[PDB]
């Protein structure tokens, strides 16, 4: 017998702000205790009609090596103590994609009432304690796929085509570009020199970097240009990563300018946040 306990503290700012309607969920970020990734789930206004006036809180097992028994307890931190705790009588069985919790954890009326101090500064901070139970490991290195692939790009290795960015000549790989981008694909399928005249070389270097490693380390300093590049080459995740880089900078200074930028490259998430920002500041 072995028992592994581990906490998690989730903070949701402006609990009254979130638009989530009865039936929508806000999934927190994953977390382990040092092979399984967990995370919490919260339905600001209930799981369904029976619980429209309550908050539904569930512990969810996100990833795992193809079953785990766990007990859990939820509570809201007021000084930092525990209030309104609910916990399983026993350990429940979880599996990749399974969740367990309380459909009717706490009434919205109660939680939103200030005399309960459950939302100091309108900040709901949830607290989950998990106790995994097992009956009675090698050091695995971290995936280095994205790194070794970026090597192909940095040091030009085994290239097979040429991308011309406003005069500039870059060596790259038809296959990788194709698998990683619909626009590049359509090109190499309908022939080794591609003319690119809609992206500045500095931004292009960054954009390729994304295509080969899934990362984009200078993103925060050319988010507007990288948002338009990501848009013109169907790189949806890059596009969304530029979208929040711009969303977090959003201010009464560049809000009208970010909105425009969002309406042209059709940045869904960013357009919402900007409209919602400009209004709550009108």
């Amino acid at each position: 017998s072995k028992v592994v306990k581990f906490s998690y503290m989730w903070t949701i700012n402006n609990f009254s702000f979130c638009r989530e309607e009865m039936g929508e969920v806000i999934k927190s970020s994953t977390f382990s205790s040092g092979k399984l990734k967990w995370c919490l789930r919260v339905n600001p206004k209930g799981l369904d009609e029976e619980s429209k006036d309550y908050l539904s809180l569930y512990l969810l097992l996100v990833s795992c090596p193809k079953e785990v028994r766990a007990k859990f307890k939820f509570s809201i931190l007021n000084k930092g103590e525990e209030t309104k705790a609910m916990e399983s009588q026993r350990a429940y069985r979880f599996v990749q994609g399974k969740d367990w919790g309380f459909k009717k954890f706490i009434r919205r009326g109660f939680l939103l009432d200030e005399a309960n101090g459950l939302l100091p500064d309108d900040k709901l901070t949830l607290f989950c304690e998990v106790s995994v139970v097992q009956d009675s490991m090698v050091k695995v290195p971290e995936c280095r796929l994205a790194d070794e692939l970026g090597g192909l790009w940095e040091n030009s290795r085994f290239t097979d085509c040429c991308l011309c960015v406003a005069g500039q000549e870059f060596q790259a790989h038809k296959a990788i570009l194709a698998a990683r981008s619909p626009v590049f694909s359509a090109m190499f399928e309908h022939k080794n020199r591609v003319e690119i005249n809609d992206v500045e070389p500095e931004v292009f270097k960054e954009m390729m970097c994304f295509i080969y490693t899934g990362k984009a380390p200078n993103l925060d300093k050319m988010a507007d240009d990288l948002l338009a590049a990501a848009d013109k080459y169907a790189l949806e995740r890059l596009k969304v990563m530029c979208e929040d880089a711009l969303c977090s900078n959003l201010s009464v200074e560049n809000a009208a300018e970010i909105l425009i930028l969002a309406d042209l490259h059709s940045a869904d998430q960013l357009k919402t946040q900007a409209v919602d920002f400009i209004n709550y500041h009108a």
Partner: peptide, 6 residues
């Protein structure tokens, strides 16, 4: 009372 959606 504990419940799930899965």
């Amino acid at each position: 009372e504990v419940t799930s959606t899965t």
